[PDB]
Amino acid sequence: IEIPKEVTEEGKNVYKKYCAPCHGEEGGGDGLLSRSMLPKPRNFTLGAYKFRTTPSGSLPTDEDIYRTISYGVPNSTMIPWDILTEEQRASVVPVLKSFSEAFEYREPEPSVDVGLPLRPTERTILAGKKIYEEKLECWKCHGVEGRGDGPSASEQEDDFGFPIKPFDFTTGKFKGGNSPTDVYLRFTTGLNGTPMPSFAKELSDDERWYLTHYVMSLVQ
Amino acid sequence: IPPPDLYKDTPAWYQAVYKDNVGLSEGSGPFTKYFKAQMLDMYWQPNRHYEPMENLDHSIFIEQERRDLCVICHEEATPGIVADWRSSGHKHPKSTPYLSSKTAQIEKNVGRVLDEVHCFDCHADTEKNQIRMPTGEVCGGCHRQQFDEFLREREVGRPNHLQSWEANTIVPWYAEAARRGYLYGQHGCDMCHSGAEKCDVCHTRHKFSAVEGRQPEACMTCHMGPDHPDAESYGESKHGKIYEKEEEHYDFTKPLVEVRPGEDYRTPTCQYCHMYEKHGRFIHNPVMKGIWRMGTVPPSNLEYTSSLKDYPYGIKIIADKIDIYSEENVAKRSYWLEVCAKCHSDRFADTYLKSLDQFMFQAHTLADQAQKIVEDLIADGLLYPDAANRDPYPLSDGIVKELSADFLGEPVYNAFKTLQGKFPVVGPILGVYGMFLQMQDNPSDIENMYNRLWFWYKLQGYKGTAHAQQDVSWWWGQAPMMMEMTRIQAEAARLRRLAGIEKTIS
Amino acid sequence: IPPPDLYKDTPAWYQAVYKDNVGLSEGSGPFTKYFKAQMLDMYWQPNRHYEPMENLDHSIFIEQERRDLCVICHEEATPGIVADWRSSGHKHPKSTPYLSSKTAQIEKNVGRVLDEVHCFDCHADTEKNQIRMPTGEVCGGCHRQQFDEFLREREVGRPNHLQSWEANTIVPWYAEAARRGYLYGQHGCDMCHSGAEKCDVCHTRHKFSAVEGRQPEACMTCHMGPDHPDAESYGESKHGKIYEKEEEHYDFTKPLVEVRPGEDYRTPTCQYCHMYEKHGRFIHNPVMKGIWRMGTVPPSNLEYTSSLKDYPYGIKIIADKIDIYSEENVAKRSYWLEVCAKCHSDRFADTYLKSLDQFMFQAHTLADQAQKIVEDLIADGLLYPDAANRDPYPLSDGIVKELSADFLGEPVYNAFKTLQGKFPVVGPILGVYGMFLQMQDNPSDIENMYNRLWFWYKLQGYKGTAHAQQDVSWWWGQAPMMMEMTRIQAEAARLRRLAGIEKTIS
Ligand code: HEC
Ligand code: HEC
Ligand code: HEC
Ligand code: HEC
Ligand code: HEC
Ligand code: HEC
Ligand code: HEC
Ligand code: HEC
Ligand code: HEC
Ligand code: HEC
Ligand code: HEC
Ligand code: HEC
Ligand code: HEC
Ligand code: HEC
């Protein structure tokens, strides 16, 4: 439904009861249970969201945040919050936005246009294999099979100073969603706060569908 | 059918100090007001000491019966627990004919269908909408037969697992150590006596494997050390050496009553020897056939020279002298012989166990002779410092205030009320406090020498003899017992020599 | 890129006494001139003590680069070494995708092609045409990342493997024992502290198996016994019992960072717990997260009654009091909780490790109370014989001659120069000499009673509590600690009683 811009008392309470234990009382990702948690809960104060429909460096839209709250983040303790009502999940969006000054000064960039997903073929997969292994050498961080055991894997770090070793995605549980549109979105938007950049500039729309098709090919 | 109750047939005063939920704000037992529980008692003794979580509220996941969210979160928060649970028979209870069969009977008993046993089933309190540490009473809700056979340990008395937390905190030197700032020095005590409300103690947590519960290693984390070297004496025996080297061909998937002696086990396990009840019948507890129980209680078949001739001193609590040749213990010995006869001749087995009796008779005799030496020094007033110039018996003020002649008898309680515990207590059961805690010149050097004789070296030789380990029997047992007798005699002669000088200096 | 150097960031005086190659003609450390090295120090500490072979000249096989003749001869001279080497990843470095991958990066770093790693590569000195015992500096030539992560042990200080040979020979009672003819009585010392230049110490020789380096048994030859019962406390814990009985389903072929908690390991290993660095990052050394390090250094969070209130007495060398609740150690504790949270709740893990802290606080308190009793006897001049009529502190002449206030501070060095070591040294770190060597009436009986309290029984209960072994915690720990307190009080009362007679005889 409609996500408010205003902060409400209900929004404070929902965050307090269901989000503060991990993300912290002030959204610093420093709840008590964050000391022993891996991956670390998001520090909302930086305004850096991994999963957006906006280009690299931009803030998330209010709908981007509501989507992540509803769907959750696989390969982490970030469960789906479908257990909460539509309004409850929408009332905490401004609470998360109030943790970062960047939301008050800049406006989120326009959402990218997905377009029509290209038909996967033997041709598109091999064109993505070429990009993955030769043109951009994604096996550096992710490995030849995408297991997350490449040479540069163990040394990767957040912009928050935390180790972010790329998880094995051959299970098919992508953090932003396991849809072909979801994976294409990640390559078109980039993951803010992580060494995983946007390839909207290095590759065309068609080439990122080629790359998406090969990435899905690595799933079991 | 009454819901499972671990504290069945216990008086209200006993349940008020052992079952009623205090927080960490109090202790347990008759001296619950004299100390506070250690932090981990939330987990070791949940009924008495568990407190709810304080960081992440779990109520909403219980209130809307979201069993799925328990797994989705803990799959990533605590992957080890989920990996165990996904691999256990609780996740796949109808995956084998054996599992399907036992599950069907449980479904009839609980009136429910059990396609899986979930974290919700063991942890989610529905009435209060809070997370719970499942005691044996929750487990007994489904496994009623195992709960009752475990409850049958009460029939033989202490020591046993059912009354394990009782023995931990009922002794007065537990609270006294906490009074003096050594509460957490007893960390291993609460951890080892936690098998009273935790059923994950042999078959461990979240795998709950009957295969794991039946192998000897499941008992060895607790049953080891100087006062009960059970793991060492068995493991290093021919029974244990053959098991360790032939374990691949042991079939631990078969329940004990289905185990063919010789073909499935070549040598017996702790569970096979001890969980045998009688006449080919097994039971889900290992204590039913004990005779020499711990090796500490003196047998009634001996004539003692120390005050052991008057044990147990009219004390209602502690056990009286064991009659080795009573009708009850001769029958118990015959049940043991039924186990040994499956791989030995009756003669060889009876000859060996009769040698165990002979070792214990001479070992208790050796301990009595050492206690006579210590008590003669006391009677001759040669103990230095004397009972007047040293700390009293541990928690003597709490003993007088909390106990009575109903517990200790008139002569023992009268002495505590009159003398306020300013007297020595030497020998089996209640004289062992010096093994655990050192107060102001109490005990003395020679009292703990004797304590190590009857509570360490007699017990190690006992377990070595009973478990067929010759090195533990002699070199951990008899020979150190003789060595403490050497130290006790030299100290007795030293105290008489010093006194013989303090007199010719007047 | 600078060649690998184990002695990086060490002063020239330190390398002159620890790295510069003397033969067996001299010792090592500041007291290198006071003793001679044991024979096996050629192999335990090659840089300092190795000498060339003397029977069969190997130069011609090196001079003509006859790698083939090394195998042809040793295939029959020492078949075991060849059998290990033929089965190792050094013989078949491109036999698996994992091995082929790591080999490719090494080929780039060394500018060479490595179809096999030969005896020539590890043993043949090319410049001098002699056989060499490969130290970690040779291994670091190819395994530069592992060498540097091993070198990072210097960041936390002693104890660690990098500075292991330092700790062995730097203490003054090593050379003193050699002065008196007991040099080879320290045979196990040089053998156990040899993990400073030998990389074959966890993953053993000529098989160099990462699978073997990752299983707990690789550490148990060294980490056992009365001052560090690490093998016993882990092995007999539920973590170790489950590993020993489920080891067939542990995947030790996976590096630690790829190990899935719960599915690959059900319970952790020494390597999994200790080689974890922080935040999901592992490191090739086990010492980075130590807090209570050995259990000997007193924590600063306690108020002591003995001279521990003034520890470390202005001594620059030994470590100062550990602040358990410093920002650095709270972060270290959080790194531990990241390990435990993979199979436990944060609450259960934090509650347990907080109990480890409480056990150590009360154990250090118990040791301080015992040290007060011993020091009061010294202050009252009741130590018999006194410091005047007994041997001085071990190697007091060498301490004055070789050390200064730069090492020990002005007050400690001034006392050694003035009194020539004719004074007692009691308690943590430098008072432990009596544990190792007995000189002429030095130490006394009661000093070694206390030594066993804080260096044996406090440490065993410490390791038992930290490794979740309840029997080691109490019966190897607290209870023996209380028993030494019994002996210390009786001896203190005995020495005061004797003196009270020697006065009324004047
Ligand atoms: C190191 C700088 C990397 C390079 C080069 C590539 N990737 Fe990456 N990737 C990296 C990190 C640190 C992360 C985040 C991991 C986390 O735990 O958050 C990622 C993420 C991905 C994903 C997952 C997307 C999702 O929704 O979960 C994918 C599918 C992915 N990366 C693909 C990918 C491709 C195609 C690359 C070459 C163009 C590539 N990665 C390079 C680190 C790095
Ligand atoms: C993510 C939001 C979780 C959900 C959904 C569930 N659990 Fe949980 N649990 C989670 C964390 C981060 C913790 C640690 C809390 C702490 O204080 O350290 C826990 C804790 C537990 C425990 C342990 C209780 C104790 O005293 O140690 C249990 C037994 C438990 N959780 C069970 C449980 C159940 C039954 C759930 C479904 C109703 C459930 N959890 C959901 C994370 C999350
Ligand atoms: C009802 C939901 C139950 C609860 C409460 C407990 N258990 Fe259970 N358990 C249940 C079933 C239907 C089964 C499968 C059939 C069978 O009885 O074997 C089990 C299984 C076990 C096992 C054996 C599993 C195996 O060997 O693979 C054990 C050892 C066991 N259960 C123990 C146990 C404990 C310790 C409990 C309290 C924490 C407990 N059960 C509760 C049903 C139910
Ligand atoms: C595991 C190594 C244990 C530790 C630590 C503690 N106890 Fe225990 N205790 C344990 C066993 C296996 C037994 C019986 C052994 C046998 O063969 O019978 C006992 C026995 C006792 C007893 C006497 C028996 C009784 O009256 O019930 C007492 C009084 C007792 N234990 C108390 C006790 C205390 C005070 C402890 C530390 C402060 C302690 N135990 C630690 C197992 C273990
Ligand atoms: C058959 C060879 C056995 C094996 C295997 C195990 N135990 Fe045993 N135990 C056995 C006998 C014949 C006795 C003496 C019984 C008597 O009182 O006459 C014991 C004794 C004990 C006890 C004391 C209780 C008692 O029965 O008196 C304990 C606590 C004990 N044993 C423990 C134990 C453990 C831990 C074992 C596995 C390592 C184990 N036993 C194996 C016979 C046999
Ligand atoms: C030679 C290879 C033997 C064969 C064939 C059988 N037995 Fe045996 N037995 C043998 C030895 C060396 C011993 C021990 C001798 C000693 O003094 O210790 C035994 C002992 C027995 C016993 C004694 C009690 C016991 O140990 O259980 C019995 C009851 C026994 N043997 C039975 C037995 C049976 C039934 C045999 C045929 C299947 C048999 N033995 C063959 C050596 C040999
Ligand atoms: C059933 C009638 C049996 C026949 C036929 C054989 N054996 Fe036996 N044996 C049997 C029993 C019930 C016992 C126990 C006797 C006791 O006093 O407890 C035995 C004993 C033995 C022994 C052990 C001797 C010892 O000192 O322990 C041996 C070595 C033995 N039996 C061997 C043996 C042989 C060689 C037989 C064929 C001639 C034979 N047995 C037959 C039961 C029966
Ligand atoms: C260059 C010739 C090297 C020397 C000098 C050392 N090592 Fe080596 N090692 C080398 C390669 C190319 C490989 C295979 C790829 C890989 O790194 O795994 C190895 C292998 C090992 C291993 C693992 C082998 C296995 O697990 O099967 C270990 C544990 C190892 N090497 C240790 C080691 C030690 C102790 C060295 C000094 C004696 C040493 N290496 C020197 C290359 C070279
Ligand atoms: C293996 C059983 C060893 C023997 C034999 C010796 N040492 Fe050792 N030592 C060993 C370990 C594993 C540790 C640390 C344990 C821990 O948990 O921290 C130590 C510690 C020391 C220390 C103090 C630590 C330091 O300052 O570095 C010293 C001074 C020391 N060791 C010296 C020493 C001497 C003098 C020995 C015999 C003559 C000796 N060690 C033997 C391992 C082992
Ligand atoms: C997880 C259950 C662990 C296992 C498996 C092993 N160790 Fe451990 N160790 C662990 C903790 C939490 C601690 C205390 C840390 C603190 O200081 O608070 C220890 C302690 C040690 C030490 C002392 C160094 C230190 O960290 O203080 C040593 C030398 C040690 N442990 C050795 C050791 C060995 C040899 C192991 C395999 C048998 C082993 N550890 C396993 C946690 C865990
Ligand atoms: C997965 C590899 C684990 C890690 C990481 C840690 N622990 Fe563990 N532990 C694990 C299992 C499967 C078990 C058996 C559960 C049982 O019923 O005993 C344990 C056991 C313990 C215990 C004893 C539990 C009991 O009921 O007595 C303790 C006290 C314990 N573990 C502590 C602990 C600590 C401090 C850890 C971090 C250093 C830790 N565990 C990690 C599995 C795993
Ligand atoms: C009955 C068969 C259970 C099932 C189903 C689950 N758990 Fe469990 N849990 C059970 C017991 C007997 C205990 C120990 C109780 C005690 O007082 O010691 C536990 C404990 C836990 C804990 C506590 C902390 C720890 O030991 O790590 C946690 C966090 C926990 N259990 C989690 C958990 C999860 C996530 C489950 C679903 C996969 C689950 N438990 C199921 C018994 C049973
Ligand atoms: C820790 C919990 C364990 C586990 C893993 C095992 N035992 Fe048991 N046991 C434990 C305690 C603390 C006590 C005594 C409690 C008290 O003092 O009241 C016992 C007792 C026994 C006994 C009785 C001994 C006697 O009668 O004198 C037996 C026979 C026994 N334990 C056997 C046993 C077996 C076979 C085990 C593996 C299946 C086992 N124990 C494990 C503590 C613990
Ligand atoms: C003999 C060589 C071994 C081997 C096989 C292992 N360890 Fe280590 N270790 C050894 C010594 C002699 C010392 C102390 C040296 C000194 O006094 O300076 C250590 C030290 C450690 C420590 C540090 C302890 C502390 O901080 O107080 C740790 C954590 C440790 N050792 C762990 C460890 C592990 C995990 C091992 C198996 C991979 C292992 N050791 C093997 C000697 C030896």
Side-chain angles (χ1 to χ4, degrees), chain B residues 488-506:
Chain B
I488 291 171
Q489 292 184 0
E491 181 72 0
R494 208 138 45 211
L495 291 170
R496 301 183 180 277
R497 185 181 189 180
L498 253 55
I501 288 175
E502 297 177 356
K503 182 169 185 175
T504 54
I505 203 177
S506 306

Side-chain angles (χ1 to χ4, degrees), chain B residues 42-43 46 74 78 81-82 85 90 117-119 122-123 133-134 198 200 205-206 208, chain C residues 343-345 348:
Chain B
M42 290 185 179
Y43 302 95
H74 284 274
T78 59
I81 289 179
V82 176
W85 171 76
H90 287 116
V117 181
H118 197 273
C119 341
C122 281
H123 289 289
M133 283 299 119
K198 315 210 318 150
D200 61 351
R205 233 202 315 278
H206 293 132
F208 297 109
Chain C
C343 312
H344 299 279
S345 64
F348 178 84

Side-chain angles (χ1 to χ4, degrees), chain C residues 88-90 92-93 98-100 102-103 106 110 112 114 116-118 121-122 134-136 138-143 199-200 203 207-211 214:
Chain C
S88 66
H90 287 116
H92 307 291
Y98 182 84
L99 289 170
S100 309
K102 303 298 280 288
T103 303
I106 297 172
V110 307
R112 205 200 319 176
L114 299 176
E116 74 171 13
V117 181
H118 197 273
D121 297 312
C122 281
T135 61
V138 173
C139 316
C142 291
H143 307 302
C199 298
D200 61 351
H203 26 83
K207 240 194 173 97
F208 297 109
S209 167
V211 171
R214 289 190 275 260

Side-chain angles (χ1 to χ4, degrees), chain B residues 51-52 77 79-80 84 182 187 201 204-205 212 218 221 224 227 243 247 438-439 441 452 502, chain C residues 236 238 241 245 266 341-344 347-348 352 355 369 469 471 474-475 482 486-487 489 494 497:
Chain B
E51 295 178 0
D84 286 11
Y182 315 115
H187 169 93
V201 124
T204 45
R205 233 202 315 278
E212 186 197 308
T221 298
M224 55 174 293
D227 60 323
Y243 153 69
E247 37 168 293
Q438 176 61 29
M439 296 176 299
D441 294 315
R452 284 185 294 274
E502 297 177 356
Chain C
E236 305 310 314
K238 286 298 187 180
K241 283 301 130 195
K245 295 308 295 176
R266 187 193 166 185
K342 298 173 175 300
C343 312
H344 299 279
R347 191 194 194 192
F348 178 84
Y352 189 86
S355 301
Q369 292 162 338
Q469 218 305 313
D471 189 65
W474 171 261
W475 279 119
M482 291 298 186
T486 304
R487 300 182 175 100
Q489 292 184 0
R494 208 138 45 211
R497 185 181 189 180

Side-chain angles (χ1 to χ4, degrees), chain C residues 223 230 234 239 269-270 273-274 290-293 336 462 467:
Chain C
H223 284 262
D230 307 325
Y234 165 75
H239 292 147
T269 65
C270 333
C273 268
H274 283 274
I291 300 174
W292 285 102
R293 311 288 310 261
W336 285 108
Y462 160 50
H467 289 150

Side-chain angles (χ1 to χ4, degrees), chain A residues 39 50-51 131-132 136-138 140-142 156 164-167 169 173-177 183 186-187 191 194-197 199 211 215:
Chain A
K50 290 187 185 178
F51 316 115
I131 296 173
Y132 180 96
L136 299 178
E137 302 181 299
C138 321
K140 285 289 178 60
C141 298
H142 291 282
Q156 303 303 316
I164 178 161
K165 182 172 174 293
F167 65 92
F169 63 74
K173 298 207 70 166
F174 304 94
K175 291 197 177 187
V183 174
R186 305 290 86 83
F187 303 158
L191 279 69
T194 73
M196 177 71 189
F199 301 93
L211 180 64
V215 171

